């Protein structure tokens, strides 16, 4: 039954969504201030 | 590009929707051009055109007259 | 009949269409992302 991986995996899961241990958010900090809106960062901006 | 024969004052709405996108926006630039179904010349008649209104003006206060 | 290249030409043009080799499509790749707007290479985008 090599569908056992998807137990274990689902029980682990279990174990940290209830540690409440990582939530998001909906705010984006990829870029420091006044580099997005940047002429010559265009090409960086674009592939992160 | 787009259908020339009389008075054809400044309103235009493919050049201004264009230049706001242009002048504070853009990276996003690349993708309404095929939006536009722009060709690679027609491309380039209007990016010369968004970089000479950049001395003048503002977006952000509206006037209108007529050539 | 020196209209004979003309027709091993066709005999062989309509091998190729035959073949689906080549299609064309409506997507213009002739440029980078963001330098064609780049204002240091407007005598280049002329020149393409």
Same mark, same amino acid.
């Not at chain 1, 090599?2 to 209830?18: C, K």
């Not at chain 2, 787009?2 to 264009?18: A, E, I």
């Not at chain 2, 536009?36 to 970089?51: D, M, V, Y």
């Given at each position: 039954?090599?569908?056992?991986?998807?137990?274990?995996? %689902?029980?682990?899961?279990?174990?940290?969504?209830?540690?409440?241990?990582?939530?998001?958010?909906?705010?984006?900090?990829?870029?420091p201030e006044?580099?997005? %809106?940047?002429?010559?960062?265009?090409?960086?901006?674009?592939?992160? | 590009?787009?259908?020339?024969?009389?008075?054809?004052?400044?309103?235009?709405?493919?050049?201004? %929707?264009?230049?706001?996108?242009?002048?504070?926006?853009?990276?996003?630039?690349?993708?309404?051009?095929?939006?536009?179904?722009?060709?690679?010349?027609? %491309?380039?008649?209007?990016?010369?055109?968004?970089?000479?209104?950049?001395?003048?003006?503002?977006?952000?206060?509206?006037?209108?007259?007529?050539?």
């Amino acid at each position: 039954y090599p569908r056992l991986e998807g137990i274990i995996v %689902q029980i682990n899961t279990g174990y940290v969504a209830s540690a409440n241990v990582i939530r998001p958010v909906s705010e984006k900090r990829y870029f420091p201030e006044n580099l997005e %809106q940047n002429q010559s960062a265009a090409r960086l901006v674009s592939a992160v | 590009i787009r259908g020339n024969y009389h008075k054809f004052s400044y309103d235009d709405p493919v050049f201004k %929707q264009g230049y706001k996108i242009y002048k504070s926006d853009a990276t996003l630039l690349n993708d309404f051009f095929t939006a536009i179904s722009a060709g690679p010349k027609e %491309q380039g008649i209007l990016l010369r055109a968004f970089a000479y209104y950049s001395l003048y003006g503002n977006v952000e206060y509206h006037y209108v007259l007529s050539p």
